[PDB]
Amino acid sequence: DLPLDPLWEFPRDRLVLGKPLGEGCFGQVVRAEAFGMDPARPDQASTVAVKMLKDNASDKDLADLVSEMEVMKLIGRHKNIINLLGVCTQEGPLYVIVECAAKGNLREFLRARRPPGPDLSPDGPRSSEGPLSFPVLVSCAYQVARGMQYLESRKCIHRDLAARNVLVTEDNVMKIADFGGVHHIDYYKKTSNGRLPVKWMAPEALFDEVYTHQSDVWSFGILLWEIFTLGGSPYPGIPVEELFSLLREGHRMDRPPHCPPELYGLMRECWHAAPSQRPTFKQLVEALDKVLLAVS
Ligand SMILES: */C=C\C(=O)Nc1ccccc1Nc1ncc2c(n1)N(CCc1ccc(NC(=O)C=C)cc1)C(=O)N(c1cc(OC)cc(OC)c1)C2
């Protein structure tokens, strides 16, 4: 079976499975109620997210989920990542119980909060004020950088860092998801929501199958661009075939509208050809911290 880990094992009868949250990478994820996740409050309800094997899963799918579980045990706890809460490995299906972020992923969060165009009638003194302000976008960027910096300190490379893979809590805290098959990537693969994940890959990863923390920094720069386009799709209108040759030529995305040169500056730094010429996550946290303090 699977060994028992009393440090993490949670009785499965203390879960009530609820609404499916969609296809997770290695299985499906369901919202759930947990009673007594805090052992000091055994009858207290909390909302959690539960990852489990899809129907008719292989022995490989089990291996993947179990390895994701073991990664999460190892990396420890941080404010800006999805944290492991517990597991159900005994006498029933494998459950991996993690934090549930009320507002969904960062890309959807941004796209849903785009400002009103000059389309609707002025109603109220804030008719043109959108939900999102510059300091809060910078805070989103800063928090992801702090999460990535933690992950890096734990020798963890993400390899798909993208806004879709950051979740947003009720208090607008960013939590990096799915930090733990690079030899088979379909670079033409479009996800069911229309995403082309090749557009987040560093040149060395895409061309040479090399991943480092500086590869993630490249992706971070793409995520920066998503934020300051409020959830835009990178390399707009560029199909994958054209992306290959544009990247070989050293092409980079344009500065987006309503983005200050400080932030487009950091994006271009993240996309320097040589990985040693990109900022480290520690440098990105510091740089974003300066902008955040300057504007708060
Ligand atoms: C809490 C109320 C709620 O339901 N919120 C909600 C509504 C709709 C969508 C998403 C959420 N909130 C939420 N919160 C935490 C987690 C998740 N969702 N999911 C599902 C969404 C998701 C995120 C990232 C995905 N990655 C990729 O597609 C590619 C990398 C896919 C789907 C979720 O999967 N998790 C989750 C995260 C991790 O990160 C380590 C690990 C696990 O299981 C081990 C699950 C959390």
UniProtKB/Swiss-Prot annotation:
This is Fibroblast growth factor receptor 4. It comes from Homo sapiens (Human). Belongs to the protein kinase superfamily. Tyr protein kinase family. Fibroblast growth factor receptor subfamily. Residues 1-296 are cytoplasmic. ATP binds at L21, G22, E23, G24, C25, F26, G27, Q28, V29, K51. The modification Phosphotyrosine is found at Y187, Y188. N-glycosylated. Full maturation of the glycan chains in the Golgi is essential for high affinity interaction with FGF19. Ubiquitinated. Subject to proteasomal degradation when not fully glycosylated. The modification Phosphoserine is found at S121. Monomer. Homodimer after ligand binding. Interacts with FGF1, FGF2, FGF4, FGF6, FGF8, FGF9, FGF16, FGF17, FGF18, FGF19, FGF21 and FGF23 (in vitro). Binding affinity for FGF family members is enhanced by interactions between FGFs and heparan sulfate proteoglycans. Interacts with KLB; this strongly increases the affinity for FGF19 and FGF23. Affinity for FGF19 is strongly increased by KLB and sulfated glycosaminoglycans. The active site is at D160 (proton acceptor). It is linked to FGFR4 variants may be involved in the pathogenesis of various cancers. It has been found in prostate cancer as well as cancers of the breast, colon, head and neck, larynx, lung, skin. The chain holds residues 453 to 751 of 802 of the full protein. It is found in: Cell membrane; Endosome; Endoplasmic reticulum.
